[PDB]
Amino acid sequence: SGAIYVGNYRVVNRHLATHNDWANLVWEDSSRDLLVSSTTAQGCDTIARCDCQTGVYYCSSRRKHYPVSFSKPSLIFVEASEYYPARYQSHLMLAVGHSEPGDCGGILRCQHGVVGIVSTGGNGLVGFADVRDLLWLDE
Ligand SMILES: COc1ccc2c(n1)[C@@H](C(=O)N1CCC[C@H](C(N)=O)C1)CC2
Ligand SMILES: [Zn+2]
């Protein structure tokens, strides 16, 4: 579990979104596993605007932060789940690191701020849904 709070927005994994997220829906993309809902309170999260390939992510299954090298956002095939059929997930970045179901929502950060959130994983690989291109989060 986990979300990004920037300005009047809440950024969560689409497959973990609540009824309130859908009642106050701003944008969603099933192909990215992203959903953005509106909030009343202000958000204090700086979103990175960069091409960084190194960062730090929070892994709640270990209650630890791990430094990682990660790939550029791309189309990667993701196996079937109770939320999605077998499809290519866009804007996804992989890293070598620990992840298990329950880690989705862990923020990935670089020196510039929030890069993305855990979305996939398995076999020593962790996948992150990129958010740096959503310039409308900051404006
Ligand atoms: C987060 O780490 C892991 C590790 C192992 C495993 C997972 N997640 C789970 C996972 O990746 N997905 C299920 C929920 C939706 C996901 C998506 N973005 O399409 C895919 C399946 C096993
Ligand atoms: Zn950055």
From Swiss-Prot:
Binding positions (Zn(2+) 1): C50, C52, C110, H112
Active site annotation, chain numbering: H15 (for protease 2a activity), D33 (for protease 2a activity), C104 (for protease 2a activity)
Catalytic reaction annotation: Selective cleavage of Tyr-|-Gly bond in the picornavirus polyprotein
Domain of life: Viruses
Subunit relationships: Homodimer.
Function of the protein: Cysteine protease that cleaves viral polyprotein and specific host proteins. It is responsible for the autocatalytic cleavage between the P1 and P2 regions, which is the first cleavage occurring in the polyprotein. Also cleaves the host translation initiation factor EIF4G1, in order to shut down the capped cellular mRNA translation. Inhibits the host nucleus-cytoplasm protein and RNA trafficking by cleaving host members of the nuclear pores. Counteracts stress granule formation probably by antagonizing its assembly or promoting its dissassembly.
Protein known as: Protease 2A
Residues of the full protein shown: 869 to 1007 of 2193
